[PDB]
C-alpha cells in the first residue's frame, strides 16, 4: 500500500551482484582491465537475458522479438546499471562496475580507455543531479529494453506496444511516489524520459569504442559490417519520447 506491486516485482527479479573476478592486489595493466571487463560483460549479459525471462509481458513476445530486443539494448541496459551502482554505492563519484572492479578518477585516467570512462560517467552524474529513485530506475530500465525496434517493426508489434505502454504508466506511478503535483510529476517524467532519449546517442559511442578496441586487439570487413548497425544512424528505429 506504498509501493506498486509491479515495481516491487521488478526489484525482486533484479539480478544478484555480479563479480568481475578481477585481482586488485596486482598492478593494473591495459589488458587485465580489458580482460576483466569482457568477463564481467559476458556474465552480465546472461544476467540480462535471465532477468528478461521474469519480466511481465516479455516471454509472451515472439521469440525472434525477444532476441532482437536483447541484441538492440544490452549495451544500454548495462551502462544504465553501471550508472545506478555508481550513483548509489559511491555517490556517482566513481564507476562501480562490480564490487571487485571500481574505477575512481585516477584509475580511469590511467586505464587504457579514459575517454570512454568519462562518457559512461555521464549517466551516474545525471542520476546524482536528478536524484533518481529506485522505483524510477527500475521502470526506466525496462523501457531501455523496449526503446529500439527494427525499421520494419516486430512480429508481435501490438503486444510490444502494449507492454511498453504499461511500463510507461508504471514510471508515472514511481514518479508519483514523491512528485505529488500534476505539474511537478509531469516535469519529472519529461526529465527522466528526455534522459532515456539521450542514451541513444551515448550508446553508439560505446559500440564504436567496443569495435575499435577489437580492431586494435588484432594487428575484419565482415566484423565491421555487423557492428556499424549499432554505431550508425538509419539502420534501426529508436523510440523517442520527445520529438
Amino acid at each position: 500500500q506504498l509501493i506498486p506491486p509491479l515495481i516491487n516485482l521488478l526489484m525482486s527479479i533484479e539480478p544478484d551482484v555480479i563479480y568481475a573476478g578481477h585481482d586488485n592486489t596486482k598492478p593494473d595493466t591495459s589488458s587485465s582491465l580489458l580482460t576483466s571487463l569482457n568477463q564481467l560483460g559476458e556474465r552480465q549479459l546472461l544476467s540480462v537475458v535471465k532477468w528478461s525471462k521474469s519480466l511481465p509481458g516479455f516471454r509472451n513476445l515472439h521469440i525472434d522479438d525477444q532476441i532482437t530486443l536483447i541484441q538492440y539494448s544490452w549495451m544500454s541496459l548495462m551502462v544504465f546499471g553501471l550508472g545506478w551502482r555508481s550513483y548509489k554505492h559511491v555517490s556517482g563519484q566513481m564507476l562501480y562496475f562490480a564490487p571487485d572492479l571500481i574505477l575512481n578518477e585516477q584509475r580511469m585516467k590511467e586505464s587504457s580507455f579514459y575517454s570512454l570512462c568519462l562518457t559512461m560517467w555521464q549517466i551516474p552524474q545525471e542520476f546524482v543531479k536528478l536524484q533518481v529513485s529506485q522505483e524510477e530506475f527500475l521502470c526506466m530500465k525496462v523501457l531501455l529494453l523496449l526503446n529500439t525496434i527494427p525499421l520494419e517493426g516486430l512480429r508481435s508489434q501490438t503486444q510490444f506496444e502494449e507492454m511498453r505502454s504499461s511500463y510507461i504508466r508504471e514510471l508515472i506511478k514511481a514518479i508519483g511516489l514523491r512528485q505529488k503535483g500534476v505539474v511537478s510529476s509531469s516535469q519529472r517524467f519529461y526529465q527522466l524520459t528526455k534522459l532515456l532519449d539521450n542514451l541513444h546517442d551515448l550508446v553508439k559511442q560505446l559500440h564504436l569504442y567496443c569495435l575499435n578496441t577489437f580492431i586494435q586487439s588484432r594487428a575484419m570487413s565482415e566484423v565491421i559490417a555487423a557492428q556499424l548497425p549499432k554505431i550508425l544512424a538509419g539502420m534501426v528505429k529508436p523510440l523517442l519520447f520527445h520529438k
Binding site: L45, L46, V49, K50, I67, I70
Partner: peptide
Amino acid sequence: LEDIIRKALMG
C-alpha cells in the same frame, strides 16, 4: 552475441 542471447533464452 545473437547466439549467446539465444541459447540463454531457451534454457
